[PDB]
Symmetry: D2
Subunit: 172 residues, 4 copies
């Protein structure tokens, strides 16, 4: 009965997108469990392996950091061999979303790169039909970082959340 | 009641994979409509826009040519604005497959690059869970080109065909 | 003494970018040979294999068609086995550029996908440092298609042309 | 006078590749500074920002973890805004390398995904001309993990190291 909305956020932009996507999910006929991951070294409650194992589907979100997802997120996925092994996530639908400092700061490629692990877990990936890209939702935040979630972005975040939920519905 | 198995093949390697994938589809509870595309300039029956519009799901296959799909295939997709526009393929599951001259001649990247258009058409993409990659089926054919479809490759082609069909089944 | 500026264009948007990139090249200390490819089925002079073989470096441009380059371009590259074989382009610098109907219509991914063949030919690829992306130049043309080349886009086209030329200069 | 050979390794496979690449570099007319990164949570000396700032070129290596680089590596790159900002690495050549548990466990895509940050730093990327792929060196280590670096893999690691060094030489 839930879609996991899993994300990392440093200055709140991705956190905001997560919340909007969650709402999409709810109007897709599903409950949204929004969870984040702890910072690493040498907004929301923390995710555990259970949240992943028992989700019906998943939205994965990160700020774009040099064309890839953020390392606290990567670190969380890095701990999922067990799920890989017994093969959960297999068959469950998934979508990604990202926040960016420039208009063309490589969201598409960050979204691309984030679809990869989900394909390793054998999930079913989907984007947005016909920020915001065909691969998932993106938000543009400016060098400033303060630019708030605009009209179409917020709308697209919800569309994705919804589509994800309905897909999880269809698959039963 | 059909999955479209759409491919281009020049010396038969991809044609063979198409046939094996078709069989997977049949054992997934669906009929396989195998279709190819005509060579361009300046194995199977030709595909038409109808085959695409009315499929329940789709397998797309091409030999890897410099990291991308073959241009006769690309040319066929290039003619699908109309479907894009009214938004068919939207919601329907899809998977890719490729044939290669070397072990690591970039199948993954060709498969990647082929998933892109399907995401532009708003399809749901899936690979192989836990040649053959997590992104779709690949066959290794050698510089020679004669190396035939091996045991695990043939098995993986069928798995994909099947998974595709069952997914299309689940989505109803 | 020349950089090949090789592109396909259907309604002139990419043709325009090619010209702007050519100018960048000239101010990089090199002559720009701008060439296109003939349409296929079943702006500039046509490119031949000689243009490729004897260039010092290369800019490759196409409209984004479903996340990939256009099939007339692909068809031209499809005819370069011979060069692949004897290994020209090996060592020579390359960059890409693309034109798009939407803001986030997948330029990055089209640019990505276009870098792939150049890597198969063993070229050295470069983007834009610190439309327009880090992977190459993009132009946004609108659903309309009439939106002309804007200030920063035109500037970025030239930067790339220049950087390409200077790199080819450095490599000697 | 040095190429930075920067990598993360957990069970030594990537560490081995780093060493072989280093040797390639030396025979390319350059000194190889091999450096790793510390594990994160919530083989070689550690890299510092200085190693990056003052390298003439760079090889980046990681085990493939779900289609992406390892999070300790990502975390190190995650700390390079400053270099991004003042624009070092800009103009310097770069190549990647990866180690994998399966034959087609997505090295190409991991290599791809690793080229992305280097393009954000405005480096010049190169692969292998005409494991081992056109995008960089890969090693196959088996589910076991014990499979040692084979003949052609070891040879390809050196080729890349060498090509990288010579390129850095040419650029001066
Ligand atoms: C080290 C790091 C790398 C970044 N790399 C990029 C990038 O390559 N392209 C871009 O547009 N923005 C980049 N940014 C900006 C972030 O994407 C931006 O801060 C993000 O929208 C904030 O997300 P958050 O508020 O959820 O933490 C980077 C930021 C950091 C801290
Ligand atoms: C122009 C062209 C480009 C090719 N590029 C690659 C490549 O980059 N990597 C590779 O491993 N094989 C490459 N090949 C080999 C084909 O992938 C191989 O012939 C394929 O398996 C045959 O597929 P088919 O029999 O269905 O036509 C290329 C072949 C042609 C004709
Ligand atoms: C069949 C085809 C596919 C296209 N696919 C996309 C696409 O996926 N994303 C996008 O933004 N625009 C897409 N477009 C719009 C083109 O990218 C746009 O027309 C381009 O800027 C024109 O380039 P040209 O004038 O050089 O021919 C497509 C156009 C055609 C004809
Ligand atoms: C969590 C994690 C994720 C992994 N993901 C993949 C993968 O998707 N594909 C693959 O072939 N191997 C995968 N592996 C295997 C590693 O790539 C393999 O252990 C690597 O060759 C070891 O590198 P190292 O000895 O330098 O640490 C993964 C291993 C770990 C620990």
């Amino acid at each position: 009965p839930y879609i996991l909305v899993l994300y990392y956020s440093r200055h709140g932009a991705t956190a905001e997108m997560a919340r909007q996507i969650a709402r999409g999910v709810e109007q897709g006929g599903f409950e949204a469990r929004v969870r984040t991951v702890p910072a690493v070294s040498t907004g929301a409650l923390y995710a555990t392996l259970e949240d992943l194992k028992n989700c019906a589907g998943l939205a994965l979100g990160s700020p774009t950091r040099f064309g890839n997802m953020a390392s606290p997120l990567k670190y969380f996925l890095d701990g999922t061999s067990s799920l890989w092994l017994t093969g959960s996530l297999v068959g469950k639908p998934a979508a990604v979303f990202t926040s960016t400092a420039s208009l063309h700061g490589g969201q598409e490629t960050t979204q691309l790169s984030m679809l990869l692990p989900l394909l390793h877990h054998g999930m079913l990936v989907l984007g947005i039909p016909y920020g915001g890209t065909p691969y998932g939702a993106s938000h543009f935040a400016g060098a400033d970082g303060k630019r708030s979630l605009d009209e179409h972005e917020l709308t697209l975040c919800r569309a994705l959340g919804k589509r994800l939920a309905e897909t999880a519905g269809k698959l039963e």
